[PDB]
Amino acid sequence: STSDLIPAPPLSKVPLQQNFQDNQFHGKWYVVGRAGNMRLREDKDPAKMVATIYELKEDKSYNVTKVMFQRKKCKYMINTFVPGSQPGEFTLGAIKSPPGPTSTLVRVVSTNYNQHAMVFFKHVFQNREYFHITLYGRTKELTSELKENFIRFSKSLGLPENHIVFPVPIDQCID
Amino acid sequence: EVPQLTDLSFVDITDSSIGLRWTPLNSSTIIGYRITVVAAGEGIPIFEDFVDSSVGYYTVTGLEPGIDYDISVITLINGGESAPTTLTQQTA
Numbered sequence: 001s002t003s004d005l006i007p008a009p010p011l012s013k014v015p016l017q018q019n020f021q022d023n024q025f026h027g028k029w030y031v032v033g034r035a036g037n038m039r040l041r042e043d044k045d046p047a048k049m050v051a052t053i054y055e056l057k058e059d060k061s062y063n064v065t066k067v068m069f070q071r072k073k074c075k076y077m078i079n080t081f082v083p084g085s086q087p088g089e090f091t092l093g094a095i096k097s098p099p100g101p102t103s104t105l106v107r108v109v110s111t112n113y114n115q116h117a118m119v120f121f122k123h124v125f126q127n128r129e130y131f132h133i134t135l136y137g138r139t140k141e142l143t144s145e146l147k148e149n150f151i152r153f154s155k156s157l158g159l160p161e162n163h164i165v166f167p168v169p170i171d172q173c174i175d
Numbered sequence: 176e177v178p179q180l181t182d183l184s185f186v187d188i189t190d191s192s193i194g195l196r197w198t199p200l201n202s203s204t205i206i207g208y209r210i211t212v213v214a215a216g217e218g219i220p221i222f223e224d225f226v227d228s229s230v231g232y233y234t235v236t237g238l239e240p241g242i243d244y245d246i247s248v249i250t251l252i253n254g255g256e257s258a259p260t261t262l263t264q265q266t267a
Contacts, residue, residue, distance in 0.1 A: 001206075002254065036218040041261055047216030047243065068216045070243040070265075077214060077239060096237060099210075099224035125223040132218035 020088030024113035033135030074173035190240035
């Protein structure tokens, strides 16, 4: 019953974009890189996380739409991101646990609002701690240095190279 | 190495729930099963729960219609576990 997962990193290792601007983060973000500690079945035709749409509300929470591609069909999932103790930090909307997570955390590590963003996610289910880092662009195209940073950050959190992927994107689900 | 369930089945699929059935494994090494549910393409599970070794039946609740979920059931022993038995099922 001790978890065999790669341990979640201390929060001291997960920065927040300084002077985080919630109004600018707002909008559509394409998934460019993904990395996390869940073990993922080797699949010769995996489902894809296409993009995430962050809609800033009057109460300063986000209405989040996850755009997925599953067996050749676009799918759309909704979450709410409620602000946390610092700017750029969030938790998921109250959701029933068990079997939902007992805690969540979102940290926008870095972003320049108009090009790239890198977001850290943690979901804890009692003893077991899952985490994920997503590299996002306003387009599907990012700079090598921005990608190389995401690689280095993911590694700094204890993730081996094989848990760090840049999925080939779809031409679908958005326009 | 720990035995996987070889007969995980889905039953009573609705727009918001999926029923899991399996035959409990018998070895006294087994302490229970973990159920982990991931909306397919997501990087973290949405749902994860435990049942003791007596259980051959679990209903996943609070799902979204028309989404594929990768549902894993993992055999547990003290300090160890199986490879996951994972299957994908769409809600209604």
